[PDB]
């Protein structure tokens, strides 16, 4: 019916201690048909990670839009662009496409490397700075995700245990979803190094 729900897909992001994790499913098709599992929805610009849901075309156009700006930032400033001003950047580019809205949901996940402090932030649609320091949820099955996350999470976890928690929070939610079910990637993101583990997940 609405554009975002045609293309499906979910993004979950959860702080731990000194670390963060962002995760997605890799289904991407239109309506009934699953077309591809060779589509990643988490992109990164330096050490800011951006996964994004909703309309498949506005995903790939924000990947290009944001990229172009974080080049101009890297050359000019000569340091990587920090997640904390990336949050403001997300708000501003949406909000000037106020009319002709983008039917999206950015989930920004990163680590401030100058204190070691874990940072997450959210957006849906044309702005809305969804503050948390616990988790941010987005996508077309935010309801499913949301349940798993609020009950499991105990604050200030170890990165290994953060991996157990987020693997579960995607797995159970996804097959009580019809707009997901094909593939899954979990980025465990330490403030010195980036592990990508693709999970096993039953086919729809």
């Amino acid at each position: 019916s609405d554009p975002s729900s045609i293309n499906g897909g979910i993004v979950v992001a959860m702080t731990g201690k000194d670390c963060v994790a962002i995760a997605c499913d890799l289904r991407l098709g239109s309506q009934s048909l699953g077309v591809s599992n060779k589509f990643e929805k988490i992109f990164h610009y330096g050490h800011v990670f951006l996964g994004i849901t909703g309309l498949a075309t506005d995903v790939t156009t924000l990947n290009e839009m944001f990229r172009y700006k974080t080049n101009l930032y890297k050359l000019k400033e000569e340091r990587a662009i920090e997640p904390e001003t990336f949050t403001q950047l997300v708000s501003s580019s949406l909000y000037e496409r106020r009319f002709g809205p983008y039917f999206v949901g950015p989930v920004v996940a990163g680590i401030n490397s100058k204190s070691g402090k874990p940072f997450i932030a959210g957006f849906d649609l044309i702005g809305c700075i969804d503050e948390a320091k616990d988790f941010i949820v987005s996508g077309t099955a935010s309801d499913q995700l949301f349940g798993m996350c609020e009950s499991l999470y105990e604050p200030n976890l170890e990165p290994e245990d953060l991996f157990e928690t987020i693997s579960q929070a995607l797995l159970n939610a996804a097959d009580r979803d019809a707009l997901s079910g094909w593939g899954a990637v979990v980025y465990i993101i330490k403030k010195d190094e980036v592990v990508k583990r693709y999970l096993k997940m039953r086919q729809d």
Binding site: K76, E77, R79, T85, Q88, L89, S91, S92
Partner: protein
Amino acid sequence: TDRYSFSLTTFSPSGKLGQIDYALTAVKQGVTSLGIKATNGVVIATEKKSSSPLAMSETLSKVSLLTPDIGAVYSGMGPDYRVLVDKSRKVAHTSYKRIYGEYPPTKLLVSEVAKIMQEATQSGGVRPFGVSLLIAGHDEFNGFSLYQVDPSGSYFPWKATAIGKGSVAAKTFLEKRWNDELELEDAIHIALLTLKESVEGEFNGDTIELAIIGDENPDLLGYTGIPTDKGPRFRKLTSQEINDRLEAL
């Protein structure tokens, strides 16, 4: 009609651009200002001047605020400084407090204002603004920084510099007076002492304008109850604070 869109700055037959050669002379026909960069802070100090002594001097500003961490100070023309300070602020808000929702780093602010000078060098109906600016400011990631933007549109970082008419003598004085670690307390005494060799005028806080990009002041914050942000790192020094330091030279 109008048909002034042809450049009024052109290369000279001997090379170099005549109009920017003219503008720089003008900077040394002005007032005198200097800046010293300390380890833990930055100071700028300049002379306040007016036509008659019956004119005020508190309603005039030659140290002006761009951001709460970045002040500017000039030598050159008063009228030409006034407009560019406003344009400096306008571009600092529109291209960095709307798109990053915060204030720009000193290097990034320098560069913006250098474009505005640049289109005063290119195109018709402009002649260069005849100022040299110091832009001292502080950002977190490169710490304390001192710049000089010139009539030409280049910028230079410096470790200590002066501009104005008493410039050639002043940088010679500051060459022996610069040290590898200088404290901000010590620097304040230095800048006053240099500008005392450069100014004959009756030497009070009311004629010497002092501004520091020292350290953060949570009392100029304007609010409390937020511990996350901290106040202005700029702090304009009014007559009373300078008067104690007059006596300590």
